[PDB]
Structure 1
Amino acid sequence: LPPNAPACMERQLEAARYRSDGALLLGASSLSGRCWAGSLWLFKDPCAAPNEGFCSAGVQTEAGVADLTWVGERGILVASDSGAVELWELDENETLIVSKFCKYEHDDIVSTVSVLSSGTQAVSGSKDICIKVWDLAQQVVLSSYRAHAAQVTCVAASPHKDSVFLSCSEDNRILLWDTRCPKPASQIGCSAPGYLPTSLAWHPQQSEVFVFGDENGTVSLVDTKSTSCVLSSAVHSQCVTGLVFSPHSVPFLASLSEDCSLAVLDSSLSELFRSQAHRDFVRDATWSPLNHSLLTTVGWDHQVVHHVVP
């Protein structure tokens, strides 16, 4: 067990993010029992996770972790139950994880965070209905947007455009943001109102195409250009919680749902692979940078599963 590392990891695994070198960022909350808090873990050996005694580094958070993102190779940006966006920094030796900043800007749970392509800026979304843009170096809020009319489910920064990001809300709006526009937000999606949007992922190559998941288990492919719903599949029997693209030239799409299932789809949104491995909600998926055939999922069942995709 490393120094400053908790003896026990909270049961509810919220996030799993591979770094470039193939080390594994883990986020967990305690969602029941006496104490409702969270932890951040680094596993330089991913096969050891989630066992705390084989972790490279661990720390305890004041509160649960709703969302997580790597900031470069040593930075961890945290969406907390506390309404705080937290910046955590890895050690020189990467032996311990130390809090850079903890800012209480959101008036309710911080549900979602994404680092903008700049790498010096992030967007947070909250149950307080607000979306905030952060200056990470100065540790401040540049802008706060009350665009939506209900809790913000997801924010996803454009891969390569530092001023562009997507947001989706229970107000049933998908918003495309450009901070360079005086009215920075633009409402997008299929014409007809559909089921509530629950998850967003930009295509890693095509700058104007993204996928969204819905509360009804439908995954949909959208071109901002056409601003029309090109392709939809009914992949899940429950809400689509996460959408992750493979690092492949022509990327595979990992689909995760409260139906406790993982799905892998082609670019035609057809189903290549499905895993019923988890026996509770599947929270995250991260493809290995090392072996692109490898997909790691975490769930509230506290399973760290390593998938081999055909």
Structure 2
Amino acid sequence: CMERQLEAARYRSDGALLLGASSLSGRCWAGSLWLFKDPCAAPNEGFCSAGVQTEAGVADLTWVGERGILVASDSGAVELWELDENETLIVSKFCKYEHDDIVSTVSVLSSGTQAVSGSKDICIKVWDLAQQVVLSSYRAHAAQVTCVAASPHKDSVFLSCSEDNRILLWDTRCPKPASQIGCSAPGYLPTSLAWHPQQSEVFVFGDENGTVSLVDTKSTSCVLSSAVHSQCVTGLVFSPHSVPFLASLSEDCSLAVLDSSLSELFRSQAHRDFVRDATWSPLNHSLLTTVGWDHQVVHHVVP
């Protein structure tokens, strides 16, 4: 049994699609992980490569190399799952309950051996994925942590944003590791973060009002802004192109594809519910797969 609310979708190096779903209504509020080596067969359960039911619903996931799956659970747990040698089963490597509320976001650092997790318990934790222990726990925010994003190439640097209207840049090599960025005045609450793949000092963030903004960590100034969506921006995904595109997702049930100037180039209203996750295909850099709470897996082609 697969649940209706598709939560996350990630491609693998060989073109396989990892899906994470939850049941946010009905008798059971659980979740499930799935792996489709035929991406066009998703989300049909009978034509999947692997699949497992988990304890509670998943709120965010991410790959750990080519075999690991890191899951943020509603139970307050961080779970590492591993694939079978023949990649037919999804077995649990560890499941640690260190957060006191729903773990809402998780991100693997650049080395691949450590990760960072954020939860509604306002805390942000650093995990050693090999020792299955928490290296450090920080209580820097004053409200629910909305998103955390590891830097692409620095193992000690990562962004975080919470409902306390703070956007914190983190360098764990400092005695005070967090530093506040944010736009000039108290803007609308930050809801989505994404580092730039080519520029290690530049990122983008989307707020609750539908605005996507391009910021540089050095000059800490809103370099650009665009009212892209009519509702909260829940996700921001860059493309693997040399000059990358920006995929913006919102609760207005629409996907937008913008350029380096945050100008709208493509738009899809195929989903009839919230758009949760989007991923670009490594084999075909022009193919973008989106998932949503309408149990739809859409494959767009983008010029």
Task: Provide the TM-score with structure 2 as the length reference.
Answer: 1.00
Q: Distance in 1 between matches of 2:143 and 2:182?
A: 17
Give the distance between the partners of 1:44 and 1:59, measured in 2 at CA. 15
* Equivalent-residue separation in structure 2 for 1:213 and 1:231 (angstroms): 12
Report the number of matched residues: 303
TM superposition shift of 1:94: 0.1
Q: Show CA shifts across 1:155-198 (max 9, x none).
A: 00000000000000000000000000010000002121100000
What's the offset of the Cα at 1:17?
0.1
Deviation per CA, 1:234-268: give whole Å up to 9, x if none. 00000000000000000000000000000000000
Partner Cα distance (1:164, 1:9) in 2: 36
Quick one: distance in 2 between partners of 1:233 and 1:161? Answer: 28
Q: What SS does structure 2 have at the residue aligned with 1:278?
A: coil
1:255-289: per-residue Cα shift (whole Å, max 9, x none)?
00000000000000001100000000000000000
Between the aligned partners of 2:183 and 2:44, the Cα distance in structure 1 is: 44
- Which position in structure 1 is the counterpart of 2:240? 247
Deviation, 1:120, is: 0.4
Q: Which residue of 2 aligns with 1:3?
A: none
Secondary structure in structure 2 of the residue aligned to 1:250: coil
Q: Take 2:292 and 2:74, find their aligned partners in 1: how far apart are those partners?
A: 19
2:76 maps to 83
CA distance in 2, matches of 1:224, 1:245: 18
Contact 1:79 1:110 in 2 (8 A): yes
Shift of 1:110: 0.3
Match of 1:267, SS state, is coil
Q: What SS is found at the alignment partner of 2:193?
A: strand
* Shift of residue 291, structure 1, vs aligned partner: 0.5
Post-superposition Cα deviations, 1:64-102, rounded to whole Å, max 9, x if no partner, equal 000000000000000000000000001110000000000
* Secondary structure in 2 matching 1:222: strand
- SS of the residue corresponding to residue 26 of structure 2 reads coil
Which aligned runs of 4 or more in structure 1 are off by greater than 2 angstroms?
none
Provide the secondary structure at the position in 1 that maps to 2:282.
coil
Given that 1:189 and 1:222 are in contact with CA atoms closer than 8 Å, whether structure 2 keeps it comes out as no
Q: Does structure 2 conserve the Cα–Cα contact (< 8 Å) formed by 1:69 and 1:78?
A: yes
Q: Measure how far apart 1:298 and its partner are.
A: 0.3
CA contact (8 A) 1:123 1:155 kept: yes
Alignment TM-score, normalising by the size of structure 1: 0.97
Distance in 2, Cα, partners of 1:208 & 1:192: 22
Aligned-residue offset at 1:134: 0.1
> What secondary structure does 2:40 align onto?
helix
> What is aligned with 1:306?
299
Query: C-alpha offsets along residues 26-69 of structure 1, whole Å, 9 cap, x if unaligned?
Result: 00000000000000000000000000011000000100000000
Q: What residue in structure 1 maps to residue 215 of structure 2?
A: 222
Give the superposition deviation at 1:118.
1.1
Q: Counterpart of 2:184?
A: 191
Q: Alignment partner of 2:284: what SS? A: coil
RMSD of equivalent CA atoms: 0.4
CA–CA distance in structure 2, aligned partners of residues 87 and 207 of structure 1: 28
Where does 1:62-81 land on structure 2 (aligned, <5 Å)? 62-81=55-74
Q: Contact between 1:253 and 1:265, CA under 8 Å: does it hold in 2? A: yes
Answer yes or no: is 1:105 the counterpart of 2:137: no
Tell me which moved more, 188-197 or 118-127.
188-197
Please report how far the alpha carbon of residue 218 of structure 1 lies from its aligned counterpart in structure 2 after TM superposition. 0.2
1:289 aligned to which of 276, 282, 289: 282
Pairwise CA distance, 1:133: 0.1
